[PDB]
Design a protein around this ligand. Structure first.
Ligand code: ACP
Ligand code: ZN
Ligand code: ZN
Length: 416
């Protein structure tokens, strides 16, 4: 880190005025400096809540050119376009349903960040070459780039990017430090001598706990409630993750027996609906969001104190991203799984519905790994971190591990 140059005054000024931060995080700066000043391909792995979006939003804003962001999650791109607009950064989603006037303005440099799907991107390389020649593309970002190894044939089409745009660096974002996924990303995207970075994965302010369902929803959730003389309330802002819309309706119906303010959050909700939930949750006009999806502005909030998984999670990478929505302000939060053996069998049936055998076998292994996490008598955090590091993490390596704030098993081993 000693070798890296510090950001200069213009760069920090830009960071403060358009993104509202006083300093870059260390790995953000490594990626940004590498892409912006060294023009190098990057594969970057960042913890939840670290700040991965800044890595591709900042460079084109600083130089006043175009950053191309490729993602399959259209609703999430819509959400990020709105957040950028609220910060006076012009951005748009570009697709086949977009108006000609937006495309006209993109060709004139009016938009700093252009979001597209891999499908649209693969059939419009001619447009991207015109943008490169007329305006200049600072970088191309591919998050969900693991999909190139949930596999998506749409991502393999991105292999033509480096042919059409040999001068444009690509930033690939992925969830784990797995070398096998990284090798597929480099191969499929044709990256050249990419810079590889990893923040590490620990969220030390997230306490981990697993407990058994008791047979009744209200009995399960009562420990997370406080009863003022006037009314019931959650201890703090809370997300309850459910495995289905049906379970969401069941959980929500029970919470409303106590007149608790909540909202639901599902895939397929409109832009307006997502904006309404974001507004009410951020302003604490609702105390709880019961969710079947783990991304989007509906659950983007700084002070989530409690995450509850109502039912056994199916895989440890989804679990990590779901609990990572908590504690973004750095203050103490708690993450509880409530599970029953019956969950595991329903989990087992949903994986038999996976057609592709290789993907189904991978998912079945991820479930077995999650089942071992739920049953463990050892440190929960050590198990999760080892999966993301793709190697056994030593307990002595982090000060949080083995303390009363680490996890239920660490706490119970100390309290007796
Ligand atoms: N240099 C910096 N200093 C302080 N906070 C920063 C920061 N860069 C980013 N952040 C904040 O860190 C948080 C994490 O941002 P990030 O881009 O990872 O959101 P995210 O993980 O939800 C992307 P996605 O929606 O794809 O999951 C945000 O609240 C962001 O404002
Ligand atoms: Zn340099
Ligand atoms: Zn522990």
């Amino acid at each position: 880190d000693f070798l890296w140059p510090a950001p200069n005054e213009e760069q920090v000024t830009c960071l403060k005025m358009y993104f509202g931060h006083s300093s870059f995080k260390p790995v953000q700066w490594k990626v940004i400096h590498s892409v912006l000043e060294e023009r190098r391909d990057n594969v970057a792995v960042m913890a939840t809540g670290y700040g991965k979006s800044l890595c591709f939003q900042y460079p084109p804003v600083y130089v006043g050119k175009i950053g191309l962001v490729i993602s399959p999650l259209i609703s999430l791109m819509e959400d990020q376009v709105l957040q950028l607009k609220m910060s006076n950064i012009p951005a748009c989603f570009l697709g086949s349903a977009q108006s000609e006037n937006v495309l006209t303005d993109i060709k004139l440099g009016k938009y700093r960040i252009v979001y597209v799907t891999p499908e649209y991107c693969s059939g419009n390389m001619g447009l991207l070459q015109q943008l490169e020649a007329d305006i200049g593309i600072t970088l191309i970002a591919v998050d969900e780039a693991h999909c190139i190894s949930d596999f998506r044939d749409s991502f393999r089409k991105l292999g033509s990017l480096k042919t059409a745009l040999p001068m444009v660096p690509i930033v690939a974002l992925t969830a784990t430090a797995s070398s096998s996924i990284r090798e597929d990303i480099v191969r499929c995207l044709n990256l050249r001598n990419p810079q590889i970075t990893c923040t590490g994965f620990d969220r030390p302010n997230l306490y981990l706990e697993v407990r058994r369902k008791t047979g009744n929803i209200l009995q399960d959730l009562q420990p997370f409630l406080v009863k003022t003389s006037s009314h019931w309330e959650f201890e703090g802002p809370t997300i309850i993750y459910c495995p289905s819309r049906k379970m969401t309706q069941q959980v929500t119906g029970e919470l409303r027996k106590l007149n608790l303010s909540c909202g639901t959050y599902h895939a397929g909700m409109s832009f307006s609906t997502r904006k309404d939930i974001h507004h009410r949750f951020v302003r604490d006009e609702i105390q709880c969001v019961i969710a079947t999806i783990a991304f989007g502005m509906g659950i983007n909030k700084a002070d989530i104190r409690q995450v509850i998984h109502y039912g056994a999670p199916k895989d440890m990478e989804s679990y990590y991203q779901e609990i990572g929505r908590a504690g973004r302000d750095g203050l103490q939060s708690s993450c509880h799984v409530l599970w029953a053996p019956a969950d595991i069998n329903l989990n087992r049936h949903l994986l038999t519905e996976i057609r592709n055998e290789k993907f189904r076998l991978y998912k079945l292994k991820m479930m077995a790994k999650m089942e071992k996490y739920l049953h463990s008598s050892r440190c929960r955090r050590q198990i999760i971190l080892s999966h993301f590091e793709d190697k056994q993490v030593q307990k002595a390596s982090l000060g949080i591990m083995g303390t009363e704030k680490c996890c239920d098993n660490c706490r119970s081993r100390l309290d007796h």
